[PDB]
Structures are given as structure tokens and as C-alpha cells.
Design a protein around this ligand. Sequence first.
Ligand SMILES: Nc1ncnc2c1ncn2[C@@H]1O[C@H](COP(=O)(O)OP(=O)(O)OC[C@H]2O[C@@H]([n+]3cccc(C(=O)O)c3)[C@H](O)[C@@H]2O)[C@@H](O)[C@H]1O
Ligand SMILES: Nc1ncnc2c1ncn2[C@@H]1O[C@H](COP(=O)(O)OP(=O)(O)OC[C@H]2O[C@@H]([n+]3cccc(C(=O)O)c3)[C@H](O)[C@@H]2O)[C@@H](O)[C@H]1O
Ligand SMILES: Nc1ncnc2c1ncn2[C@@H]1O[C@H](COP(=O)(O)O)[C@@H](O)[C@H]1O
Ligand SMILES: Nc1ncnc2c1ncn2[C@@H]1O[C@H](COP(=O)(O)O)[C@@H](O)[C@H]1O
Ligand SMILES: [Cl-]
Ligand SMILES: [Cl-]
Ligand SMILES: [Cl-]
Ligand SMILES: [Cl-]
Ligand SMILES: [Cl-]
Ligand SMILES: [Cl-]
Ligand SMILES: [Cl-]
Ligand SMILES: [Cl-]
Ligand SMILES: [Cl-]
Ligand SMILES: [Cl-]
Ligand SMILES: [Cl-]
Ligand SMILES: [Mg+2]
Ligand SMILES: [Mg+2]
Lengths: 696, 696, 351
Amino acid sequence: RKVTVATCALNQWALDFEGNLQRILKSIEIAKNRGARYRLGPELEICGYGCWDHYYESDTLLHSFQVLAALLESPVTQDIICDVGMPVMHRNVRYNCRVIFLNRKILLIRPKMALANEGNYRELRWFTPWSRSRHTEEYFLPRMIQDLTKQETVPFGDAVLVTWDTCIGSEICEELWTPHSPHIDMGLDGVEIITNASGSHHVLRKANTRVDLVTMVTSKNGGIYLLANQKGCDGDRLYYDGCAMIAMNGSVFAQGSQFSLDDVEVLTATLDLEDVRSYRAEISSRNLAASRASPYPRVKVDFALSCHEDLLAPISEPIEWKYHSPEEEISLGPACWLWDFLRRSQQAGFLLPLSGGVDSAATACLIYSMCCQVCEAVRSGNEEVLADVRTIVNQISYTPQDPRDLCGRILTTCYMASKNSSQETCTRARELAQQIGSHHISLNIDPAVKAVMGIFSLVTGKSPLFAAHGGSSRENLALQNVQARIRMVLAYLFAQLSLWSRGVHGGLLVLGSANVDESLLGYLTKYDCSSADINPIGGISKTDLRAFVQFCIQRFQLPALQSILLAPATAELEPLADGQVSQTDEEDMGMTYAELSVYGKLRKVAKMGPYSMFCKLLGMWRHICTPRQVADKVKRFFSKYSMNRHKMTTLTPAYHAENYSPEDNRFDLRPFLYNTSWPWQFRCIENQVLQLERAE
Amino acid sequence: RKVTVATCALNQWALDFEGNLQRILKSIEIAKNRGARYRLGPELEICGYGCWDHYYESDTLLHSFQVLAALLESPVTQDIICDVGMPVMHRNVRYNCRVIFLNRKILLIRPKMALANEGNYRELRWFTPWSRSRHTEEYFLPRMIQDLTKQETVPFGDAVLVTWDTCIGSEICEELWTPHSPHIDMGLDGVEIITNASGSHHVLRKANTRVDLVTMVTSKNGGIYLLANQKGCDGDRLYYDGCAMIAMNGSVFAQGSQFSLDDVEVLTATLDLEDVRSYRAEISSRNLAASRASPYPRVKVDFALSCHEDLLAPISEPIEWKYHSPEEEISLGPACWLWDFLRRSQQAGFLLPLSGGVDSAATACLIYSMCCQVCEAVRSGNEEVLADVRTIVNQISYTPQDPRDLCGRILTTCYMASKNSSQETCTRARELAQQIGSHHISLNIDPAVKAVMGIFSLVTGKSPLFAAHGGSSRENLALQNVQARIRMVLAYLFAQLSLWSRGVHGGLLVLGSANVDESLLGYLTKYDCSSADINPIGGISKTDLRAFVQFCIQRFQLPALQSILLAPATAELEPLADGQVSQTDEEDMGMTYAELSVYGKLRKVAKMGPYSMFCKLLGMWRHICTPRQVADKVKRFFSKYSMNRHKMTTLTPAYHAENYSPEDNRFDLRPFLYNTSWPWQFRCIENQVLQLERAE
Amino acid sequence: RKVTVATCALNQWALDFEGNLQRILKSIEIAKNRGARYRLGPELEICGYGCWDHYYESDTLLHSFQVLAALLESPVTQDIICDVGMPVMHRNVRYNCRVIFLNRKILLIRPKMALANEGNYRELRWFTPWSRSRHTEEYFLPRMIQDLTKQETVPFGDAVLVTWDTCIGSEICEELWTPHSPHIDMGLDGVEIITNASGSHHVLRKANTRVDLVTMVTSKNGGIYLLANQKGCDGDRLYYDGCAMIAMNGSVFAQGSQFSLDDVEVLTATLDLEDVRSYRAEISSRNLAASRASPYPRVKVDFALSCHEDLLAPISEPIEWKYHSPEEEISLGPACWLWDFLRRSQQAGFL
Ligand SMILES: Nc1ncnc2c1ncn2[C@@H]1O[C@H](COP(=O)(O)OP(=O)(O)OC[C@H]2O[C@@H]([n+]3cccc(C(=O)O)c3)[C@H](O)[C@@H]2O)[C@@H](O)[C@H]1O
Ligand SMILES: Nc1ncnc2c1ncn2[C@@H]1O[C@H](COP(=O)(O)OP(=O)(O)OC[C@H]2O[C@@H]([n+]3cccc(C(=O)O)c3)[C@H](O)[C@@H]2O)[C@@H](O)[C@H]1O
Ligand SMILES: Nc1ncnc2c1ncn2[C@@H]1O[C@H](COP(=O)(O)O)[C@@H](O)[C@H]1O
Ligand SMILES: Nc1ncnc2c1ncn2[C@@H]1O[C@H](COP(=O)(O)O)[C@@H](O)[C@H]1O
Ligand SMILES: [Cl-]
Ligand SMILES: [Cl-]
Ligand SMILES: [Cl-]
Ligand SMILES: [Cl-]
Ligand SMILES: [Cl-]
Ligand SMILES: [Cl-]
Ligand SMILES: [Cl-]
Ligand SMILES: [Cl-]
Ligand SMILES: [Cl-]
Ligand SMILES: [Cl-]
Ligand SMILES: [Cl-]
Ligand SMILES: [Mg+2]
Ligand SMILES: [Mg+2]
């Protein structure tokens, strides 16, 4: 009848065994206080999901087991079934596993059967899928575990648990949406509870597909579904957004946070198993298509999941899943990201080159949002967060209440004007900093620039001129770039010495402000301020950035943003001749951010090369453009793209948000020395155009 | 009786279909002129091996076929069997394939059955292995091919080719390295000739493994074995080093270049099939197993490998494989990789910061080596090299004979001294430049440094001091780093404007000079000159570098190097107080380049975390060090490594040389925000140390 | 690229071969006027789904074939692929089938693999599920059909059609919600269009589950989904409420009536196949869990589903499915029921 189960989101850290252990323990202790008899944790939670090439290392395996032993001998784990994740090597093959134990015995080790090998995922690099479906083998335990557990071997493979009162089965992360998912046969076999341990990272706007899936599955097959997921940054450019859930028969009973500053969040629910049994009768109490397939092996477990609590235990009522707006998503994720980055880097704060333009502004807003979250958290009684703030600012007695106050201690904004900067942009940056609370620095680079160009003249005997002073296209560009790069040099100097100049220990993380759209076209200066330490908006669309900044006005009460939004998007690096005004980035690029986004998505999402893309747009923009015209747009896109790709190889690491990122380290593997005339492809395009231009 | 076969190495280029088509045609034409009736190409040669995520694009598939259709309708391919590679989608699964055609008819498509998923390889990201052994399906041909070939379908799978006189089998690359390789069962079923198309890249010293393996195989199994490989840079960090070979019954019959400036290099041999047959007939255990061997599907082909060429057509005689010394390898690999960048980037030359030290010196030697190579190639009658040069140099009449004259056209060294630089280092740089013939630039950064520091003072009211002037540790470092990044600002300014100042069109690629040992430890300044466009020595050991440079003294007649070798490895950026001499980078790092090299190899090559590494060293350095000491060495390494790993994320792409490269984009994936205290792991280490101190 | 397909709801009548034929013809004629190159009809539409114990009767089989012959020799069926349903006995075993023909040839006969045996359904009483998955056998045609079609045998079993431009597959009624549905492997194999012929009867309030399913399926696997269903009373206490639909990539493009007094209702839609191909790339352009299962047999069909019409043919835009309130459901179904009862009973009225 009535059972009480727990799932959870943990902020795990790659190879951080000590912390990882304490987090797992805490969740189990929490679940037990709430009356749970089964606890589900995230995929590979013992070592942290993102260990990458450390999985090749045997030490990883070893410590994981030492962590497992600690769990097994811990008095908290008594009388609750615990499903943890670690790597495990069986017969010289490395598997991504679930280790399920109860009262100092291992019940079953259950290896993953479908591995993620797309986008940021590459599990086949380190793990093998279990291929012997509906079968188990005897796994031989480490003497370390034997001595403790008093078992020689345990079942290893595709099996389910049978207890005195129920039948629980495992579905690991992506097995949930893999063709022919375990949950189908488990359902058929009569499995009433299905646990899914995830490690899925944030992706702007796609939170609902996870929820929908679990929902549909429970709706279609009946049953309780448990989903646990990592939450936070585990040591790289991903943010895991654990929307841990508990679903039954198509309804949701517990909704876990997508972004929060909690290291441990536990969901429970009290459900009557008979609701499953009667909901399944409601559908098909009959037989099926006559399948006669090999049935699931069964691990007998001497334990009752439901135990006497009924007399008081309130049944969980169904709930509606509340989603975040896309702007709320943006204001929360990169924000919580930046918080883990700061706290785990053990760095003294951030250094933000603030230009008075939209992106640098958005970046500033993310920090302010971070501060708010921290204040919220501290108010909420979050000891970990309080501990951390106190450690970051060095003040034992400190207690952030006003976000502007915390911000000041944590953020240093820096406006670096050139000879041609307007008074307006300088002002806007000054105002925005004033409003969020940051320590603002305003300086002029021109003395350093004059000096560099002096060195050049001194040695070549030649003086480059700006385009407006009769300079060549090359000279103009070079000059612009020098200023860009001097800014970067200065940014790092302050990162390294500004706190020093204020009488205080420590150094700052440099933050970048490239957006995903310009990153793709390479419309940036190699090694200017586009290269920093971390970039939180690197993966966000320009349009979304504007959207996010306009949303910040009212949510954070920052009026300084209006002028910033209204101002013309221009880079004041070159003097303006009489009769003309500044050129906008969109004219500079030779395409609007809108249409740039389309190329982006057609390229990475829809997997189109130039010919394919030419054909798509030809129809999409059939009214607006002519065949010759789209050819030119596409050609212009691919050439600029290819010419600039090398800029991508060295680009600052970015929070992952859009599934159309051009990021080269993990998500978008590509050449960087292309033939930039695309002779063959472009010829195909021409032929098509010529063919169409034969119509009357 | 006698058959004439060809294999080759092509300098393919990712997505360069036009180019790739022309090079394949050339190989086939060269093959025919030399009398071959079979021609084998490299792995995925139509599209070029390294298209990475473009493999997801239908356009890659489509254009590959268009190339194929071109090959099929081409007169040159008449009466020679052609083994060509491309990706194929079959039943909506994407495979790495060989396509064998003859006289406008596709004979068979052979999919790869084992993929490479380690190191720089990750075929599983985009392809699936064919897994039905000795089995075949019908491939439905694209309409375009049908209209040309008048075929509806062709066999797709694990099949062999039967001619009137022989039986030909395919082994694709990594299949040769798998435990139960195809060549075993193939040889037992009477396949006489085995063809292997590879696409494997350079690794210092590992050339013999490929040779020994193919030789062993034909020795153990009998038969002729052909290997083809890409040669050169196809668009990324890798150099494919085509050691294409022909081997029979354990002897080599043709050895292809490892590094050469040739786009197309064809090997042919004339062999007697009767030698194969009698070699096999002499192995009793083989024959006992061959009269019981499981059969391969055979595609019957109306063709004779041995024609009316028999008339005294001279049988090929056995040869000894000649190898390169490790220094010759270094002298030739990155050199060719550099030529390929220069010509395929359509850039006007290189800009090399030259410090008067070993590594930058090495980089200079590579460029000179390249120059010699180009000169040698031109003297050989190589028309594409001569064209390529004239294009780079914009003078259609130019003929590089002297290596020093070419060098001055395409290289620009740049010495950049600080206030503290010594006169010696200046002169070493200058003397090296004179001797290789580069255009040398000598300047002082001090004016620019003062200007930047003046900016900092104007805005903070504080002035940083060098440690020798009582500055703090941080001040001293900030100061050193500033100078360092200023050098980078200048480097790019000259890269962009130096030719302009000399009244010449174009720009330069900036070369880096980070070695693989410093890259590992993070012993470099983020965004100093460590950050360039490409780094030809970023994957090479400090010890190999010295060895290389010392080799260059006699090989290239460059005496300036001796002083460069003999001089103390010091970075003159800070002033030294008297009573004290300048600190070497080895005491700066806190470890010798030697012990560093060991950490790096134990790390990547032996897959070792800090506990494992401590254990290994403890035994290795048992005489030299005490366990307490070993722990400190290991902890210091791991500490430094992980505090600095972020420097890897934005670091300049390096030519891949060692298999212990710490490169983060492809070869060595790792997190970049570690818990740098390594609590768990260091605890385990201290436990062992205590345990060892108590007992004895 | 652009194709035009048709599905339909028919008011079929058990054993009413004459009428059943004329209804099928009419739908095909309508589809052709609308430019369709493939037409999908309901489950067992030739004999009418509700024949019950008449399925034991060989006459049923016979007339069905005589009806099939009439379809085959009819000039209306020219240049459109027609998927009709009849019972068919292969090797002395009775199967509930799809007969797909084009220009007086049978392309493939495709038998049901999961049979409904719950509530009002009892298909196992008369039919056997096809159990040899991913396999076909040579079905020997009746001389009646041979003479007309000039074919000795045709493929019988679990197969897909491959045309010059696309790949079409079959999912019969309840196979849509049976564990391990054909649409999963068909998707994997690259089937771009999936036809589902239904005979599902009205059930108060449960209309959305049909729509949701088709929707979710196309959303999850990509592809065009076609669903046809009987509509009206076929001679007993059931009302079939054909919510025939056309779905693609998770959106609905055509919504058929649940209750109407039409004997024939045809849905069409003009869709670009490349939307499927690019929507599937959007999800997983990679590989899967490494399944290595026996793949679908392929019937080669010398026909192009898309033919030159593009230059004028408007692409169908997505629509929202409009449901009836429960009271509207009540006011319409039993109502349309009573109408067929009155008209087919040949009675003078009600008391
Ligand atoms: N295939 C290849 N592989 C490796 N390297 C390659 C290469 N092709 C060129 N390179 C090299 O890469 C280097 C590129 O860097 P660099 O020479 O500095 O120039 P680059 O970064 O290419 O040009 C900077 C761009 O930024 C834009 N801009 C201007 C002003 C402000 C802003 C702003 O929004 O902040 C942007 C401007 O319009 C310009 O197009 C060159 O040295 C070039 O030789
Ligand atoms: N976990 C983490 N994730 C992301 N970023 C992190 C980080 N931890 C620190 N950071 C940040 O990274 C930045 C590091 O750069 P920076 O502050 O400039 O300083 P950094 O590059 O760390 O220090 C330079 C090193 O180069 C050596 N050096 C000196 C003189 C000459 C030479 C030579 O051979 O050329 C070398 C010197 O001994 C020193 O150890 C800092 O802003 C820091 O806050
Ligand atoms: N005036 C400025 N002050 C501070 N940072 C700037 C300034 N201008 C540009 N940046 C930085 O440079 C990048 C944008 O380049 P630009 O478009 O030329 O303004 C972003 O990373 C900014 O943070
Ligand atoms: N005096 C110099 N002149 C030119 N390049 C230098 C100089 N010193 C250092 N570099 C560059 O900086 C890196 C080495 O740093 P360092 O060890 O401090 O000399 C290499 O990439 C060198 O090319
Ligand atoms: Cl052990
Ligand atoms: Cl069992
Ligand atoms: Cl400090
Ligand atoms: Cl802006
Ligand atoms: Cl803007
Ligand atoms: Cl100090
Ligand atoms: Cl120019
Ligand atoms: Cl040195
Ligand atoms: Cl040295
Ligand atoms: Cl008959
Ligand atoms: Cl087939
Ligand atoms: Mg902006
Ligand atoms: Mg050196």
C-alpha cells in the first residue's frame, strides 16, 4: 500500500570525493527524516558526472569505492534502500553504474545500456554499454567491500528489485528517450516504481521536454517515476539544472528546482501503490500482442518499502509544474553558475570590462542577480551559502542583506575609454555600476596606445593612420585592434592588482562578454576583451540578451538599462569624418543578428552545409529574396564563418545555453583551416541559381 | 602470375571536394601510367578525413557522391579497379566506407567494422560500425548514380572481391589493430591481397609500429598487404604522415614518405601471386585451419589483375624500411605542417617572436627547415610546390634556390627587450636571424610598459614595485605579466602591419613557442605570447627541443645556436638586486624539466591520479627521495597543474607530437575548475606516508 | 520534396460490398481531384470492420477480392497509391490486412501484428497476428487477380515501401499503442511517412488520447503520420467516430470530423519531406544505442510521390485540434447513430 520515496538534486564536483560523500550522506539523512525508505541520487554522483578523461584513471574507480564503503558503514543509511552512481569495471570493462545497497549489503549493480554520444556528451569515450539484456553476471567485490559487507559477489546487470511489497526498476538518464526504453518492458513485467538517475545540463527552453516525457511515460504505462539530477557546476562550462521529479500515472507530485544555490535538495512523496495497480487495470488488465520475450531477472530483497506509517502519513496530492520564462531562465542559470565558479575557484571576485553596451550590461545583471540569489539564500537559512560568502569576503561576521552591498564587495567594473569614446557610453557605464553597487573604474587607454604606436614608428619609420585620416583599410583595422588588445592587457592588470590597490588580498576572475551570434561569425578581435577567464553569456543569443536586459529593468529596478538599450550599437574605436556617423555592428557584419541566428540554427541544429542551407532559405525567404540574393547571403555567411573559425579555438569558455553553440572544445568539433572559397559547394549553389533564373 | 598494384598518400583537405577530386584523379592516372590494375586510396579520401561535425551534414554525403559520380564517368579510371573512401548513409545509419568501382560500375561498398574512439579519434560521434560479419545487404543507389552507372543496387557489407586471377579484401585502418582482425579469417578463406585505407596521424617515434605490424601480419598470414594514408594537414592540429606501404609474405616492397611536400605520392609494386600461394602452402598449422575456414561473401568481377603485362615486367625486389631519427622527425613533421598552413591559409608569411632562447630558436629552425624543403622540392621538379610559393610571394617568376632568400620573404623574427633584458640575448636573436636569413625586428617594450603602469597609477594612486625594489610577490608578478602581454599586443601589431611598413601587401601568422611541458604545468602567462595563431612545437618535450636544436647546428650550419644552447634558461623581465643572479625557469617551476616530463607521462600515458602516481614514484625514486618527499613532489605537481588548467582552455592550437599532450580541445579532455586541495586524494597519500614511517 | 497525401473516414457497412466499394472509389476520386498521390483508408474497409462471425465465412474473403478486382480495374485509381483493408488468408491462416496497389499492381499485402482483444474487440476470434517480424513470404494471388494484374505472387508481411523519393510504412490501428510499436523501428530505419488504418469506436471523452498519441509519436520520432478511421454505424451497437488526421513533426495539419452525416470525408495535406529530414537532424543526426536488429524489408516501387506540382502547391499550415464538449459529444454521436440506424433499417421512423 502506502510508500514514501525520495529523489534529489546534488551539486556534485568532479573528483571532489570528500564533498561528494557529504552531499550524498546529507540527502539520505534528509530523506530518512522525511520517512523515505528508498532514496534515488543522480548519475555518477559519487565521483561527479563531469570527470571526463579522469575516467581513464584507476584512482577514480578506487576512491569511488572508498566513498561507497564510507556510505555502507554509515549509521544514517540504515533501513533505507540507497541507489548511488559510480563507475565500475567488470571483467576489464568500464561501465557507468547504479549501486543499490541496503543495511550494509549491496543488492544489485546496474550498468547503463545506452550511452550519450551527442553534443557535450561523449560517454563512449570511457564507458561501454551493457549489451547482455535481461541478464546478470556475478560481480566480484573488492576485498575492501567484502570485509565490510560480508559478500563475495553481487548481481551485475539488467535486473529489477523485488521487495516484500513492490518491484523497483532502473532507467539511467538518456535510456528514458532511447528507442525501446527499459520502462516499456519493466511495465509489462509489473515494475511499479522506476528510478532514473540523470546528469543532464541546462539548455535554454528545453526544460519541459524532460517533464513531458516522464509525464507521458507514466500516463502511457502507469507507475511511479523518480528522476534525480545533478544541480550546479561540476567543474566546467556546463550547468546541470536538476529538475528532479516524482511522477505517477501521468501526474506530477514533486517538482525540484532548476536553479538554486542549494548543495542538496531532496524531494519526497507519499504514494499508495494500489493507485498504480488500479490505474493499470483501468488501461489493459488483459494480455498484450503475445511477445514471449526474455523476462527481467529478479533480485529478491528482504525489505518492506511500506512500513506501518499509513496511520498518519498523508498521501501526496498532484501538482502543476511551474516553468521559468526564458528571461527568468537567463537571469538564474548563468547566475548560479557564476556563484559556483566564484566559490570553487577560491577567487576574490570578478572583474568586468563594462562598455556601456548591451552585452557587458547583461553580464553585470547576471552578477547582480547572483547577489540577490545569495541574499535570498542567506535569508532562507542556507548555512552553506552564508559560510561561502563569509569565506569569499573574509569577514566572519558578515551577513549579506542588501544585494548592492554584496555586489560592491564582489564585482569590479571597468570602463576603458579610447580617444574616440563618447561621453554618453562612459556615463551609462558609470550609472549602471552606481545602480548595482559595483566598484567602478573609469580610465583612458590612449597614453598606452600612443606609446605602442610610438614603438612601432620608432622602429619602422612609418605612422599608421585611421581610415578617416586617409589611412588604408589595413591600417585602420590594426589601430582599432591595438586599442582592443590594450584593453585586455589592462583588464588583466586590474584583475591581478586592483584589490591590491585597494589594500586587500586576492585577485579577480576576468569576465568576458561575447555573445553566441558574434562568436559564430568570428566578428571579434583575437585576444581583445573577448578573451577572459569565463564568459557567462557566450552561449546566449543577442536577441535574448536584449530581451533579458529589458526584463531586468523592472525585476531589479535598474533604470540605467533603458538608455543602454536605446543607444546605437557602435564600437567607438575610430574617429568619425565630417558628414557621416558611426557604423553599427549589424552593418559591419553584413547581416542582422536575426538572420545571423537563423544561419546559426540551420547550421548546427538542422545540420545544414551551404548547399542545404541555400535550399532551405530559398523557400523560407521566397517572398523576401530572389535566388541570386539568398545565394549571396549564404555565401557571405559561410566565407566569413570559415575565415574566422580559428578565433574559436582560443575563445574563452562559455556557459552553455543554446544548442547551436559554435564552441570548439566540446560541443562543436570542426576544422579551423578551411578552403574559404568553398569552390565545389558554391558551384552547386550557382548551378541551382542559374537553373531557376531560367524561368518566365 | 604477376599483378601490378598501387597505393598512395594524398594531402586531402576537409570539404575541399574540388581539390580532393583532382588529387584522386592524379593518383589513378599515375597508377595507370605505372601499369597498375588496382588503386587503393586513403580513409574517407573523398571528403578528407577530418571533417569532424560536418559528418552530421547531409551535404557531406551528397557532395561525396557527386565526386564519386565524377570519378565514375572519368576516362582516366577505365580498366583499373579503384578503392575510394566516403561516408555512406544506408538504411538511415551513417557508415565509414570503401567504395570499389570498375569501368563505370560500383562493385561493392565495404563499411568500417571497428571505429577508433580514443586520443584525437572519435568516429563513434558520427559513424556506426558494421557488425554483421561476413554478411551483405543491398544498397539502394541514389538516382544520380543510377542514371550514370545503370545499376539499381550494389552489395553493402563484409564481402570480398573475386577476379579471374585473385581475391581482394579490405581492412579499414583500425581493424588491423583490433584483436580479431578481418585479415585472419580473410587469409584463411583465400583472400590473396588485402587493402587498408588509413587516416592516422603523426606521433613522435611511433612510425615503426605501423611498419612492424603490417610486416608481421603478412609474415604470419601470408599474402600481399597494401596500406594507404593521408599525408599532411587536412585542417586542424594533426599531421597525417602517410607511411603508405606494400608488403608481401613478411617483406616490404615499397615505402612511402612520412613527411614530404607532395600532394600525391603513388607506390606501385609488381608481385607474383604464386609466391603468396607457395608461402602459405608451407605452413602446416595454417593449412590444417584453412581447410576448415568459414567463407566470405564474394562479388564476382569480370576482370584480370594480371594482364598482358607479364612480358618481362620486372618483379619488385624487397627493401629495408629507412626511418628518421627523432630529430629528423621533428625537423620534418612540423615543417611540413607549417608549409600546409601557410599555403592553405593564403597568408603572406609568419611572425615569430624570437627571444634568444631554445624554443623560439627551435621554431625558427623549423621555418628554415621548411624553406630548405621547399627549395629541395622545387629543385625536384615539383610544380605544385613551385606554384604555391609563387602565390604566397605574389611573383609568378620566382624560383627559390637559396633557403636563406626564401626565408627572408616568408619569415619575420621579432626580438622584444624589456628594461632588464641583457645585451647577450638581443645579439643571439639577431645572430640567429642573420644566419637563417629572416627579416629581423629589434625593439624595446619599456615605453609601452611605462605608459600602462602610468595609467594604473593615475587611477589607483598606487604604483607597483618589482620584488627587488621591495614589491610584493603579487606586484612583482603583475609587473612581469604586463610586460609579457605587451609583447603579445606588439606581436599582433607587427603581424598585421609589418609588411605594410615594408611596402608589401598581406599579413602574417604569429607563431607560438610553448612546449608541451610548460603547457602541462600552466607555467605561462595567460594571453602572453603563449597565445598566438599556431604553435608548431606545443606538443614537443623540452628535452627533444634541445636535442633538435643541437642537431640543427651541423644539419643547417647555424653556429648562433651554440651560445643559445649554452646560455642559462632565464626570463629577463624583473630586475635583479645585486648579490643575486637571475632565477632559472627550473627553480621557478619548483621541479626540473625531467621530473616534469615524468609527471606528464605518468599522468596521461599511465592514466594516473595523484594517489597512483605517488605509489609509482615512491618505488621509482626510492633511492633518491623519501616517501615524505615524494608526497610533496606529487602534491606540488597536482596542485600547480589544477590551479592552472584553465590556461589550457584558451591556449593556441599546437601540432600534435607526443601522446602525453595536455591539449584540451581534442586529445586530453578535463575539467577546468578543480578542487585544488584534492582533500580525499592527498589524505590517502598522507596515510601511506605515515604507515611507511611507522614500519621501519 | 513536396508531397500530397490523403486519408479518410468512411461510413462502411458490414458485408455491404456494393456500397463499400462505391465509398472507397469516391474517396480515391476525391483525393485525386485534390492532387493526392497516396490514399489511406480505414481498417478492413472493404468488408466493413464489424462483420463479426461472418469472418469465419469464406464468402467474405471471396467478395472482398471481387471488390479488390473492381478497384484494380478502375480508371480512377490510376497514378495514386491505394492502401485498402481486407481479410486475407495466407497458408490457411486468416490475417487482417492492408492491400497496397498502384496502377493495377499489388505492391504489398501487410498483415496486422497486434490484435485487439479487449472490451468490444475480439480480433483473435477470427484473425491471427503475423508473428514473423521483419520478414515477408510470397503470397499467391487468386486467378481472378492474376489475370487482371498479371502477377503470380506478391510480398506478404512486415515490409515498407520505397519509392523514388520516399519511404512509407504501415501501423494498423492498435499497433500505435502496443508496446514496441512499428513506428519506433520504422523511424530508426528512415521511414518518412507512416500510415495507420483504424476502426476505433466512439468513447465518451477519450477523443484526445488518439490525437495526443499521434502527436507525441510524430514529435518524438519525427515524420508524417496518417490516420484513417471508419465513421458511423456499421451494423451494430458501436459508433465509429473517425477522427482521421494528418500529423507531422508534432503538429496537426488536418482534422477529420468525429460525427457527421457524410458517407465519405477525405483529408489532404501538402507537406515538404525535407521538413521531416531536417526535423530529424534537429534531434539525433547521430547513431543510437547500438541496436543491430533485423532491418525492415523493402518493396521497391517505381513511382514518385512528389510530381512537379510544387510550382503552385501551397504547403499546409499547422492547425489546432478543436474538441467537442462532453455535452456536444452526446448531442452528436447517438444522434448520427440514430440516423444511420433509421436509414439502413429502411424503417419509416421512430416511436
Ligand atoms: N586559417 C587560419 N588559421 C589560423 N590563423 C589564421 C587563419 N587565417 C587568418 N589567421 C590569423 O589570425 C589573426 C587574426 O587576428 P587579427 O589579425 O588581429 O585580426 P582579426 O581578429 O581577423 O580582425 C578583427 C575583426 O574584429 C572586428 N572588430 C573591429 C572593431 C571592434 C570590434 C568589436 O566588436 O570588439 C570588432 C573587425 O571588423 C575585424 O573584422 C591574423 O594574424 C591572421 O593572420
Ligand atoms: N579555476 C579557475 N578557473 C578560471 N580562471 C581562474 C581559475 N583560477 C584562477 N583563474 C584566473 O586566471 C587568471 C590567470 O592569469 P594571471 O592573473 O595573468 O596570472 P597567471 O597567468 O596565473 O601567472 C603567470 C605565471 O607565469 C609565470 N611566468 C612569469 C614570468 C615569465 C614567464 C614566462 O615563461 O613567460 C612565466 C609566473 O611564475 C606565474 O606563475 C587570473 O585572473 C585568475 O584569477
Ligand atoms: N569601452 C569599453 N570599456 C570596457 N570594455 C569594453 C569597451 N569596449 C569594448 N569592451 C569589451 O570589448 C568587447 C566588445 O568590443 P566592442 O564591440 O569593440 O565594444 C566586450 O568583451 C567588452 O567587454
Ligand atoms: N625577449 C623576447 N622577445 C620576443 N619574444 C619573447 C621574448 N621573451 C619571451 N618571448 C615569448 O614569450 C614566451 C616565453 O616567455 P619568457 O619565458 O618569459 O621568455 C615565448 O612564447 C616567447 O616567444
Ligand atoms: Cl581488491
Ligand atoms: Cl528470475
Ligand atoms: Cl595574495
Ligand atoms: Cl550594444
Ligand atoms: Cl545592441
Ligand atoms: Cl609577499
Ligand atoms: Cl592587404
Ligand atoms: Cl632556454
Ligand atoms: Cl633550456
Ligand atoms: Cl483461385
Ligand atoms: Cl531488403
Ligand atoms: Mg551590447
Ligand atoms: Mg627556450
